[PDB]
């Protein structure tokens, strides 16, 4: 079980899974929508 986990920790890369993209998009959208509310201080 540990060896399989190591297989993914010693040979990695920086690609993205197709569910992460919606998380990124709602994060960026709410960052900007959230940013506007700072001007409503």
């Amino acid at each position: 079980n540990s060896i399989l986990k190591i297989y993914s920790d010693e040979a990695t890369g920086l690609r993205v899974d197709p569910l992460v993209v919606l998380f990124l998009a709602v994060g960026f959208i709410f960052s900007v929508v959230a940013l506007h509310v700072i001007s409503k201080v």
């Binding site: 197709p18 919606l22 900007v32 940013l35």
Partner: protein, 390 residues
């Protein structure tokens, strides 16, 4: 960098990823950009590039125009991102030099929303979607705009009353009273009329009826001894992707007249698309030569586009010889003689068809245009044609 799926996606998820990519693209559409009269880069482009004006989609879908035409692998991503940086700097310094940090922040959030739209293109393009990326958003904005015209709750002040926009007038005038209210609904022109939408449904039905026409060339293959099938040659050939581009160059000449108008008033135009049937008979000559201009230009640009791009008899003859296909009816090496007869008349007459619909629509008066309705229903029918396979 989105990981491509290793086995093909079934149809049920392939629909939902598109149905949430649209629902994230539109919310990315209508959020107001932070840090903000009537001027613009210009009005005509927005329909070509599918963007709102003044939001964080004001850069448009033109990011993925770059990395398509650039390649026409990580270096593709970084070259598109620096080209996006350049285009964003152009839009922020030419458009609406007050201060530094608002400008610095504007470049950043246009860069990030450009990155998100370029990501969703790669997501739908790798195989989770069911079509290309550029095609889907440019269908969606046209659909949203024609439904915004046909139904809207927006009111008109400063006139004679509180006037509505769309088919809301048909029910609203039931309240105010006498039988002229139907005539007052059907003919008035400051707002979009219900006669126009009863013509919009008609042109929308007619283009679907034309879209199914084809010619079935019967093939009996000989390399792998079976597979007696068809070759469809559609009437709407080359998928009318240069034709919008054709109009784009039409649209692009308009950029030079405005520049001259704002640069020099002194000097040492009928080619604009006419808008109504009433002033159509005002000049009999100019409308006639205008429709010959549109018809001839669509015909000749499709006639070239077969040659410069992908599909032409000089190549499709080779594509039949290497793939092993042989046409029926004792046509042993007359595939060229058969195919040169039939394919460019299909292409040129299809270009004339698209042009005739283009001028008859806007003369007839339609919510949208001819090019807009045609570019929408061609790609929706493309989705249905790919899915027919199921």
């Amino acid at each position: 960098e989105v990981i491509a799926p290793e086995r093909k996606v079934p149809y049920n998820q392939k629909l939902i990823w598109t149905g949430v990519s649209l629902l994230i693209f539109l919310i990315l559409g209508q959020i107001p950009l932070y840090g903000i009269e009537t001027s613009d880069p210009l009005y005509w482009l927005r329909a070509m590039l599918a963007s709102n004006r003044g939001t964080l989609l004001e850069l448009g879908v033109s990011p993925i125009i770059t990395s398509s035409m650039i390649f026409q692998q990580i270096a593709q991503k970084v070259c598109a991102i620096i080209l996006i940086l350049g285009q964003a700097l152009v839009v922020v310094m030419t458009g609406n030099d007050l201060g530094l940090p608002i400008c610095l922040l504007l470049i950043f959030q246009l860069m990030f929303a450009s990155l998100i739209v370029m990501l969703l293109d790669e997501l739908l393009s790798k195989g989770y979607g069911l079509g290309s990326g550029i095609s889907l958003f440019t269908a969606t904005n046209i659909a949203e705009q024609i439904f915004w015209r046909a139904f809207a709750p927006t009111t008109v002040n400063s006139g004679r009353g509180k006037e509505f926009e769309g088919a809301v007038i048909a029910f609203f005038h039931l309240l105010a009273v006498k039988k002229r209210a139907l005539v007052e609904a059907f003919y008035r022109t400051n707002l979009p009329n219900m006669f126009q939408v009863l013509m919009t449904v008609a042109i929308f039905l007619f283009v679907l009826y034309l879209q199914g026409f084809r010619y079935e060339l019967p093939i009996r293959s000989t390399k792998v001894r079976g597979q007696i099938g068809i070759y469809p040659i559609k009437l709407f050939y080359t998928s009318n992707t240069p034709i919008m581009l054709q109009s784009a160059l039409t649209s692009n000449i308009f950029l030079i007249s405005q520049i001259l108008f704002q640069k020099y008033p002194t000097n040492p135009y009928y080619i604009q698309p006419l808008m109504s049937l009433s002033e159509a008979l005002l000049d009999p000559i100019k409308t006639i030569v205008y429709i010959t201009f549109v018809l001839g230009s669509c015909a000749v640009f499709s006639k070239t586009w077969i040659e410069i791009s992908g599909t032409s008899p000089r190549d499709i003859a080779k594509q039949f010889k290497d793939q092993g296909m042989v046409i029926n009816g004792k046509r042993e090496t007359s595939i060229y003689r058969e195919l040169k007869k039939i394919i460019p008349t299909a292409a040129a007459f299809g270009g004339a068809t698209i042009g005739a619909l283009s001028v008859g629509s806007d003369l007839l008066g339609t919510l949208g245009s001819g090019a807009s309705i045609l570019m929408a229903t061609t790609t929706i029918y493309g989705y249905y044609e790919a899915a027919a396979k199921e």
